[PDB]
């Protein structure tokens, strides 16, 4: 506790584990309130200066990191034909339209 | 003048309605409109200013509900300490 601390705005963000993740790995029905006070410690011990931070605190702090990656689903951009006609698609309740838009009058 | 009594043992110390009920402010504006009509006439000019106020009400959006009051939780804590105790 005597080691210095870093301001809350300078500590890089970290995605800590949630109450559900801890309940599963430990196999215990951890209480939400008792876990909230335990997470504050992790946030407190995380603000210690990295260089001055000991090795033990580093490892024990790595077991609380949430290494989850959400699925990426990016839509494909609508290209433009060589002649300049872009094809859009729309549907309404039975239909399927295909509009070819070009610079015109 | 005697002082307040020490409540007997109750099944639960709580207020029936924690949050004050706020009278619809526009039932009061309607009462005024109903007053102009009786004194003067149903179809007159002196009622224009008051009728508009009633129209301004129902066009305005309803305010948001106030946060719930936590009085009943604190009363349950100090029940046995304040009253003679708990029953049942």
């Amino acid at each position: 506790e005597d080691l210095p601390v870093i301001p809350a705005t300078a500590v890089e963000r970290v995605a800590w584990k949630t109450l559900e993740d801890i309940r599963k790995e430990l196999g215990e029905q951890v209480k939400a309130s008792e876990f909230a006070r335990c997470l504050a410690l992790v946030k407190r011990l995380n603000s210690i200066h990295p260089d001055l931070k000991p090795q033990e605190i580093k490892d024990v702090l790595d077991s609380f990191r949430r290494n989850v990656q959400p699925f990426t689903n990016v839509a494909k951009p609508i290209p433009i034909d060589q002649f300049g006609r872009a094809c859009g698609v729309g549907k309404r309740k039975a239909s399927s339209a295909r509009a070819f838009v070009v610079e015109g009058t | 003048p005697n002082k307040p009594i020490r409540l007997p043992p109750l099944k639960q110390l709580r207020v029936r309605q924690a949050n004050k009920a706020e009278e619809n402010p526009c039932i009061a504006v309607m009462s005024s409109v109903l007053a102009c009509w009786a004194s003067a006439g149903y179809n007159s000019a002196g009622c224009a200013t008051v009728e508009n106020a009633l129209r301004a009400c129902m066009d305005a959006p309803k305010p948001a509900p106030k946060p719930n009051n936590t009085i009943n939780y604190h009363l349950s804590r100090f029940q046995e300490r304040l009253t003679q105790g708990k029953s049942k």
Partner: protein, 224 residues
């Protein structure tokens, strides 16, 4: 009779009897709990037995059938009378913050009230005047009023020097280039400003409500 029956004061007796013989007759009893031999020679103490409590003041010798015989009595000392007399003549002596938390409880080992008011460990308080007063009133055979004056006057001369140091210390420091922070007087006024402003807002808001109520109270339903 709602409460349950606690037999905690007989765990050794009950547990020892259950280990004397085995359920399966003809066999030797199994080893008893590991605590049976630990409290073998440490029986509980007698509880739930109302004794005659210590009498801190002579009981009424006139009562023919007194009650509350098994009721603890109030602790009263001769100083209680003096404390009340002093702190009433000096009410603002209570505003002086005094610490009652004890460090080790040995503060009474170095209190020799024959020397004077200033002692070791304890601050100069109204208590030092009472103890010094009590000592003179007992050893030197002084009256309650005489000893009160003596110990009381020594208290003033010590309090005066403490108030004179603050003024002379600050003034002396500034003569050599010593600057200080905000004094309690200025800090107190700034807080009153922040609170007064909040009252101005409330009064302004409430004043508006009252005047608005008057407009609605008066009947302007028909404009002619």
């Amino acid at each position: 009779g709602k409460g349950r029956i606690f037999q905690a004061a007989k765990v050794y007796q009950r547990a020892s009897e259950a280990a004397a013989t085995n359920i399966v007759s003809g066999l030797p009893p199994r080893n008893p709990p590991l605590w049976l031999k630990a409290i073998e020679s440490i029986p509980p103490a007698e509880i739930n037995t109302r004794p005659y409590p210590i009498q801190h003041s002579p009981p009424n010798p006139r009562a023919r059938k007194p009650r509350n015989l098994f009721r603890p009595t109030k602790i009263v000392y001769p100083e209680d009378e003096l404390r009340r007399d002093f702190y009433r003549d000096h009410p603002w002596e209570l505003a002086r913050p005094r610490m009652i938390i004890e460090l080790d409880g040995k503060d009474a080992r170095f209190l020799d009230w024959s020397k004077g008011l200033r002692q070791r460990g304890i601050p100069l308080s109204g208590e030092s005047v009472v103890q010094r007063q009590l000592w003179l009133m007992e050893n030197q055979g002084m009256t309650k009023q005489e000893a009160y004056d003596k110990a009381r006057h020594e208290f003033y001369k010590l309090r005066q020097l403490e108030q004179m140091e603050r003024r002379i210390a600050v003034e002396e420091a500034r003569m050599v280039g010593g600057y200080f922070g905000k004094d309690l007087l200025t800090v107190g006024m700034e807080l009153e400003n922040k609170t007064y402003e909040s009252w101005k807002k409330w009064a302004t808001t409430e004043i508006a409500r009252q005047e608005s109520a008057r407009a609605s109270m008066y009947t302007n339903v028909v404009d002619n």
